[PDB]
């Protein structure tokens, strides 16, 4: 359906699977894996050579293309803020007789810059806010689409449109040149970027049919961690939440409850970046109970306490609506439910999930949800509350509502440690 | 500082009964589910009895049923312990907390409670 291009993945290798057979070369420094994922790094053999079939259509000019693909581009380095804000380099080139498009980084920002025959450049961006607590788009995969026309180059993320350019003074644009996937730029040796799925049509694409590629490319059967990457068993998660973004969890002192604490944040004197510490709070580890994590598993959620395995209980019978969780070692208790199954309510793409407490597996009596609440903590005159880890039965019901309240406490997100993400 | 003041108790003969009284000090007790524990000089303290954050709901230890009864007056915000034929192996002081939840559990465990007082002694003579 007006695919000209689609590199995908195909026995530890990218193929091109549109149906006109380009030549594609991967070069050593291009890792790979079957999640679809390629990285492309400062390594001189780093790098992806596309030889387009010149023999089977046009191909010379396009009036309408666009350009799909999700990318994954890791935070700046505390210490080279300047390199990064400053330095601006290539990660796709297609150019022949000096005319053609090219995709370039600049720190924070994402460009598109068009080139005709007779010199003249055009460019459209996106730049996503490096001051912020939580971001969205920083070491984390999201999704690039660029639809060119004869008026406007827009720049869509996430099936939304962010850029618009008026490119009417743009003349005819040589497209059949190579494909170059690599790095180029005064870089640092530890600078790299992810991407995946990466798609060239011959068509300006309606922002129904982008949004509409955004989830089907989003859609999958297991569920996600922080950066987008499938979610896996036996893996060290830490754990974020989406009601209370600025809250973790620690293991209150002499006690078997989760107190929930404000998130540190960036404290040294540069005034072009913060954030708020993704690596604090308690280490999680997701159980299997009888790889990859798939919706409407049974799971343990587990933490490291100390020198040992623990595990997080919710008590059977508590009168109240919601009632701090039970942090405790690992044992068989008839006094507590042991089993989550996870959850996914959420029917827009997100890497958000849910944590159910059921009676059993075959039962149908659904305990509550686990997420976050202020309980009565003391005083009697003046009455003072405290945020503690919890399950709670209110979230049952407003998991209902549509559309789905992705600020809900009841919304986790799951934060292995990346390279992408320093502090 | 926060705190759950405990009173009653003192000196009493075998077979005898006594009555034991916690009472809030700084905090509502209603939300929390209260335990009573014992602690014998030397020995880890041991759980006695808990009850629900409400009433309704009791659990005791099964050294210690059916001699004792603890209740609730969350108007009040105190919270009883009865004690009936007393013997000489219920002696040592007796400390009262409240737990992190709403829900009592047989087991008892120390963890699971705060806010202690300082106590008060009982001893059992034959």
């Known amino acids: 359906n007006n695919i000209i291009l689609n590199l995908r993945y195909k026995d530890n290798n990218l193929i091109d699977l549109s149906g006109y057979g380009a030549k594609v070369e991967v070069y050593d420094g291009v890792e790979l894996n079957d999640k679809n994922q390629f990285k492309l790094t400062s390594s001189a053999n780093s790098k992806i050579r596309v030889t387009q079939n010149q023999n089977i259509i046009f191909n010379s000019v396009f009036l309408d293309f666009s350009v799909s693909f999700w990318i994954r581009i890791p935070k700046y380095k505390n210490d080279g803020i300047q390199n990064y804000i400053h330095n601006e380099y290539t990660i796709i080139n297609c150019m022949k007789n000096n005319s053609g498009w090219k995709i370039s980084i600049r720190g924070n920002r994402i460009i598109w810059t068009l080139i005709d025959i007779n010199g003249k450049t055009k460019s459209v961006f996106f730049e996503y806010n490096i001051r912020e607590d939580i971001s969205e788009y920083i070491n984390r995969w999201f999704f690039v689409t660029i639809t060119n026309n004869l008026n406007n180059a827009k720049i869509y993320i996430n099936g939304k449109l962010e850029s618009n350019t008026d490119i009417k003074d743009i003349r005819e644009v040589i497209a059949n040149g190579e494909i170059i996937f690599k790095l180029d730029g005064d870089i640092d040796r530890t600078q790299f970027i992810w991407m995946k799925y990466f798609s060239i049509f011959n068509t300006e694409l309606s922002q129904s049919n982008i949004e509409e590629r955004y989830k089907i490319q989003s859609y999958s059967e297991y569920l996600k961690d922080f950066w987008g990457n499938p979610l896996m068993y036996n893996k060290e998660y830490y754990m974020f939440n989406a009601g209370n973004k600025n809250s973790y969890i620690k293991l209150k002192k002499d006690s078997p409850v989760g107190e929930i604490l404000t998130r540190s944040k960036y404290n040294q004197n540069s005034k072009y970046i913060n954030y708020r510490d993704l690596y604090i709070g308690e280490k999680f580890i997701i159980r299997r109970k009888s790889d990859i994590v798939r919706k409407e598993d049974y799971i343990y959620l587990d933490f490291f306490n100390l020198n040992q395995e623990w595990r997080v209980y919710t008590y059977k019978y508590f009168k109240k609506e919601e009632e701090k969780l039970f942090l405790a070692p690992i044992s068989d208790s008839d006094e507590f439910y042991n089993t989550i199954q996870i959850k996914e309510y959420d029917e827009q793409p997100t890497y958000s999930c849910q944590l159910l407490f059921k009676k059993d597996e075959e039962s149908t009596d659904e305990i509550g949800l686990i997420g976050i609440h202020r309980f009565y903590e003391s005083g009697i005159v003046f009455e003072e509350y405290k945020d503690y880890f919890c399950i709670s039965k209110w979230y049952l019901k407003e998991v209902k509502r549509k559309p789905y309240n992705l600020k809900l406490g009841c919304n986790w997100q799951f934060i292995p440690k990346d390279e992408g993400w320093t502090e | 500082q926060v705190q759950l003041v405990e009173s009653g108790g003192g000196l009493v003969q075998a077979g005898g009964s006594l009555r034991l009284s916690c009472a809030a000090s700084?905090?509502?007790?209603?939300?929390?589910?209260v335990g009573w524990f014992r602690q014998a000089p030397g020995k880890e303290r041991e759980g006695v009895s808990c009850?629900?954050?409400?009433?309704?709901?009791?659990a005791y230890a099964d050294s210690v049923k059916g001699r004792f009864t603890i209740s609730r007056d969350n108007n009040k915000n105190v919270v009883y312990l009865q004690m009936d034929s007393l013997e000489p192996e219920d002696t040592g002081d007796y400390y009262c907390?409240?737990?992190?939840?709403?829900?009592?559990?047989?087991?008892?465990?120390?963890?699971?409670?705060?806010?202690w007082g300082q106590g008060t002694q009982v001893t059992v003579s034959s």
């Open positions: 009850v629900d954050a409400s009433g309704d709901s009791t």
């Open positions: 700084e905090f509502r007790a209603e939300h929390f589910a």
């Open positions: 907390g409240a737990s992190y939840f709403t829900v009592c559990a047989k087991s008892m465990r120390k963890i699971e409670y705060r806010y």
